[PDB]
Amino acid sequence: STGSATTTPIDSLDDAYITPVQIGTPAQTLNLDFDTGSSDLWVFSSETTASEVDGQTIYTPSKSTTAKLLSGATWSISYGDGSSSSGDVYTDTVSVGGLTVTGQAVESAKKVSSSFTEDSTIDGLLGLAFSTLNTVSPTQQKTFFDNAKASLDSPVFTADLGYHAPGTYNFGFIDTTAYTGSITYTAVSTKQGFWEWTSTGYAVGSGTFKSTSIDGIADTGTTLLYLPATVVSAYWAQVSGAKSSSSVGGYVFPCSATLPSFTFGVGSARIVIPGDYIDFGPISTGSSSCFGGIQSSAGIGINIFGDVALKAAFVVFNGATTPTLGFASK
Question: Catalytic residues?
Fold first, then answer.
C-alpha cells in the first residue's frame, strides 16, 4: 500500500504545516501537524476542556463506530517549546492520503496548553519519530508509520514541504519526479528516539564550505533551524545590523536586509536554503525588526533541522531495519 497527502502552511510564514487525517467511522477529518520529532498522535476532542478549545475541529469518539477506549491508558507530553497536552486513549481507524491503519492509538486530549488553544488551525499532532518516545502509559503505543510499515510497498515516508506553498507527505514510495539530482542517504541514530543524523558542515552565502560534524534531528514539527552558536553567529555576521536580542529571544535583523543563503552538508552533497526562507517577518506587527529563521541551539541541548532546513529538500525517512535519512534538492 501507499498514501499521499497534501500538507499546507498554517499561515503566511510557514510556522507549521497541516495535513488532513481521517479518523473513525464515518470519517472525522482533522488537520494534524505531522511531527517527525515526536511520537504521539493526539487530537482535540469532545473530552477537551471546553475553555481550551477555540475553533479547532474535534474528534468525538462516541460518534465513531470503530472507536474503542484503550482501558486504563493515559498520555501526557511536553514539547521543546514549552507546550503540553494530556488525556486518555482510544483505538480507531486512521487514514492518511488513502493509507489506512486499523487499531491506531488516538490520544484524546483532556487538557492542552495555551499555545495549542490559541492556534485554531491545528487540530492535533501526528508523531513520526520512533515509537520509543510515545508517552502512552502503562502500555506504550506505536506511531501511525510503525503500524503501517509492514503493509507499505517500501518502509519509508517522505516530506516535501513547500516554501509559502503546499507540499506533500508520501507513505510507502519515493516520488522520483519530486526532486532533482540524486538522493543522498546518511546514517541515523535512534538512541534518543529521533531521526538523528550528522551533517557534514555548512556555508554562509557564497562563502567557503566549512567541513564540521553537526549532529541534529530532522524535525518537521519545529519551525526554525537551530544550530550551534558558532555557526549561527557566522551566519548573522553577514547581515548588516543583525544581532541577538535577549528581550526578543534570538537573532533579529533589519527587515530591509537581503538575507544570504545557508548551505548544509549531507555527506558530500549540499542543500541550499535560500535567504528568503530565513525571514520570519516583523517581531510584532508594524516593526522593522524581523525575526531570524536560524537560531542558536545552545539552550536546547540538541541541534534541530526544522522546517526552514527541511523545506529546502525532498527528505526520505527510511524506516528499514536500520533506518537512514535521505536528502535531495528540488
Answer: 35, 199
* Lookup: cell for 240: 548588516
Residues 6+ apart with CB under 8 A from 89: 69, 70, 73, 74, 75, 105, 106, 107, 108, 136, 141
Number of residues assigned to the chain? 330
Q: How far is CA 265 from CA 4, 197, 204, in A?
A: 28, 11, 12
Distance in angstroms (rounded) separating the CA atoms of residues 305 and 273:
11
The contacts of residue 95 (CB under 8 Å, 6+ apart) are 3, 21, 22, 27, 101
Tally Cβ neighbours within 10 Å of residue 286.
6
The DSSP bridge pattern shows strands 225-227 and 294-296 to be parallel
Q: Which residues are catalytically annotated?
A: 35, 199
CA gap 211, 202 in Å, rounded: 7
Dist. CA 258–CA 254, nearest whole Å: 9
- Is residue 330 within 8 Å of residue 314, measured between CB atoms? yes
- What domains are defined for the chain? 5-174 (2.40.70.10), 175-330 (2.40.70.10)
Whole-angstrom CA distances from 27 to 60, 61, 85, 192, 235 are 11, 11, 24, 34, 47
Alpha-helical (H) ranges within 222-315 are 229-236, 307-310
Side chain identity at 303, as an amino acid letter?
Answer: N
> Structure solved using which method?
X-ray
Residue with cell 542543500: 271
Instruction: Tell me how far apart the terminal alpha carbons of the chain are, to the nearest angstrom.
Output: 25
CA atoms in the 13 A half-sphere facing the CB of 308: 24
Shortest CA distance to 34 belongs to which of 128, 136, 164?
128
Q: How far is CA 133 from CA 41, 163, 311, in A?
A: 12, 29, 24
State the sign of the Cα–Cα–Cα–Cα dihedral 222, 225, 228, 233.
negative
Whole-angstrom distance, CA of residue 305 vs CA of residue 265: 12
